[PDB]
Design a protein around this ligand. Sequence first.
Ligand SMILES: CNC(=O)c1nc(C)n2ccc(Nc3nccc(-n4cc(N[C@@H]5CCOC[C@@H]5N)cn4)n3)cc12
Length: 267
Amino acid sequence: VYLDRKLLTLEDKELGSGNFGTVKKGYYQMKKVVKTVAVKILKLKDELLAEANVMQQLDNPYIVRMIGICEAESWMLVMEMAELGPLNKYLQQNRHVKDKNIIELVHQVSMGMKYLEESNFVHRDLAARNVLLVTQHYAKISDFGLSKALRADENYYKAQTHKWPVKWYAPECINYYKFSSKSDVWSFGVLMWEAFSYGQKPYRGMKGSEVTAMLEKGERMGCPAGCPREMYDLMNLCWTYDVENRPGFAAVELRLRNYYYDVVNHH
Ligand SMILES: CNC(=O)c1nc(C)n2ccc(Nc3nccc(-n4cc(N[C@@H]5CCOC[C@@H]5N)cn4)n3)cc12
């Protein structure tokens, strides 16, 4: 859990910011090899510790691995490096990634979210900026800063006061401050839209209030160019207003698994 700073080599040039601070590339001298790492630097500490506490409990191929934490110049969250970076930035810079490949990546995210749902954890920040690419064909979920372990007696987490990405938030998050695996299903639908739109921001040119007003009328974002009808149908199903009627990640992952192999068969 607690790493030796002397074994941690940090690169001078940062990968970027992120509201919590900065993301840096480094190396952690392991048992026999060297491990390339992405480090979240604080430069709030309670939030970094809670994020690391969540990530330590997670063991899945589609969730970023936390190597550990390190208390030095600043508090550091050390993760296994996914070299290609955020899914949204990647797709914005590689607009010729095939449709089959987008299905493959969004299906990988649903597999990680299926695992997260079974573990009874709520992510609360499921966005394409929080999906990291190991390879063009390998996605992982990172950014567990707003993540919650659900109580043994409740299916939701209730926030006590609203700095919220409203464009990814389900109506019950807004109206009742209630966060569940089904609200992550809503955000996953927004994430699908972003990915099929090659990293375009959702609800372009709209205020958070205008987004809520649109969703309340029953209006939804349109089909991104080239997106198969079946994928846009799944997107819309993730955007079911009623929490109970909205599918869980086991149903969402199965629709994606089947459609992915169907597209793999056609090809
Ligand atoms: C700030 N920019 C980058 O993070 C970034 N830029 C480039 C060019 N990268 C390349 C590889 C890489 N790898 C990598 N692997 C494992 C974990 C991470 N984590 C990054 C975050 N937090 C970010 C907050 C800011 O938004 C993006 C993220 N969600 C959480 N985990 N990162 C990251 C980046």
